[PDB]
Structures are given as C-alpha cells and as structure tokens.
Amino acid sequence: ACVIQGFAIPKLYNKVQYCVSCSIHNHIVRVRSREDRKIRTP
RNA sequence: GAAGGGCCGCGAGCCCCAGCGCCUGGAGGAAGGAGAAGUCGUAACAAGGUAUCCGUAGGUGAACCUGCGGAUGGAUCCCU
Numbered sequence: 351a352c353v354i355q356g357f358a359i360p361k362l363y364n365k366v367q368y369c370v371s372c373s374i375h376n377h378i379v380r381v382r383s384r385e386d387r388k389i390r391t392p
Numbered sequence: 393g394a395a396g397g398g399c400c401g402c403g404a405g406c407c408c409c410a411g412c413g414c415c416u417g418g419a420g421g422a423a424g425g426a427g428a429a430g431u432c433g434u435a436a437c438a439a440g441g442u443a444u445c446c447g448u449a450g451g452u453g454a455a456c457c458u459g460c461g462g463a464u465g466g467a468u469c470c471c472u
C-alpha cells in the first residue's frame with residue numbers, strides 16, 4: 351500500500367541495559383550449574 | 393668557773409593552707425548479664441516474599457524505614 355517506488359522498511363537500533371535482578375526475573379540470563387558458569391559462549 | 397640570759401646553726405611537734413593518691417554514702421537516671429516459658433509484632437537465613445551488607449543523614453512502639461555514593465561476601469564469570 352505504499353506509493354514510493356523502491357521504498358524500504360526503516361529499522362531500529364536499540365541497546366537494552368538491565369540490572370541482575372531484572373535480567374534473571376525476565377530470563378535474559380539464567381542461573382547456571384557450577385561447571386556451566388565458566389562458559390562465555392553467546 | 394655553775395645556774396641563768398642574747399643571737400645564729402641543727403631540727404621535733406603542732407597549726408594553717410594548698411597538691412597527690414586510694415576507699416566510700418546518695419534521691420534520681422541509664423546500661424549489662426542470668427532465671428525466666430509474660431505481652432507485641434516478624435527484621436534475617438530460600439529472590440525469606442521490597443536481594444543482603446558498608447559509610448553517612450533524617451524519621452518511626454519495637455524490630456526497622458527512607459535518601460546519596462559504594463561492594464558481591466549476588467539472585468549474573470555468557471552477545472553491534
């Protein structure tokens with residue numbers, strides 16, 4: 351339903367920053383096993 | 393040449409004032425400890441139901457609450 355020939359959808363770039371409590375509560379990070387804590391893989 | 397006397401040198405005793413201990417009375421006031429099985433709440437230990445804890449300031453019956461900066465001994469060793 352656009353009119354512009356060649357129009358593209360604009361994106362968004364937002365950096366989210368949380369504390370530890372909020373991160374765990376909303377599940378951005380999980381409590382891990384003692385072995386698993388040493389893993390830095392994203 | 394004795395008693396007796398004068399002035400000083402030595403130096404008791406007492407008085408009087410100040411220091412210096414040590415012990416002790418006291419209306420009230422305010423702590424600590426034990427016997428306790430007495431009221432009132434539930435601050436902490438689990439995310440203890442508002443993560444906990446340090447410094448500081450103020451406030452509330454009580455534990456405690458709140459603001460400003462800090463720490464993990466956290467409930468996160470992990471992402472243009």
Ligand SMILES: [K+]
Nearest residue numbers: 369370371372
């Ligand atoms: K936190």
Ligand SMILES: [K+]
Nearest residue numbers: 415416417418
């Ligand atoms: K006294």
Ligand SMILES: [K+]
Nearest residue numbers: 426427428429
């Ligand atoms: K008793």
Ligand SMILES: [K+]
Nearest residue numbers: 435436442444
């Ligand atoms: K508390």
Ligand SMILES: [K+]
Nearest residue numbers: 435442456457
């Ligand atoms: K409370």
Ligand SMILES: [K+]
Nearest residue numbers: 435440441442
């Ligand atoms: K509480």
Ligand SMILES: [K+]
Nearest residue numbers: 371442443444
């Ligand atoms: K807290």
Ligand SMILES: [K+]
Nearest residue numbers: 437443444466
């Ligand atoms: K805690």
Ligand SMILES: [K+]
Nearest residue numbers: 442443444445
């Ligand atoms: K706190």
Ligand SMILES: [K+]
Nearest residue numbers: 447448458459
């Ligand atoms: K404080």
Ligand SMILES: [K+]
Nearest residue numbers: 448449450459
């Ligand atoms: K204050």
Ligand SMILES: [K+]
Nearest residue numbers: 451452457458
């Ligand atoms: K207050």
Ligand SMILES: [K+]
Nearest residue numbers: 451452456457
């Ligand atoms: K209060």
Ligand SMILES: [K+]
Nearest residue numbers: 452455456457
């Ligand atoms: K309080």
Ligand SMILES: [K+]
Nearest residue numbers: 451452457458
């Ligand atoms: K308060």
Ligand SMILES: [K+]
Nearest residue numbers: 442456457458
């Ligand atoms: K508080």
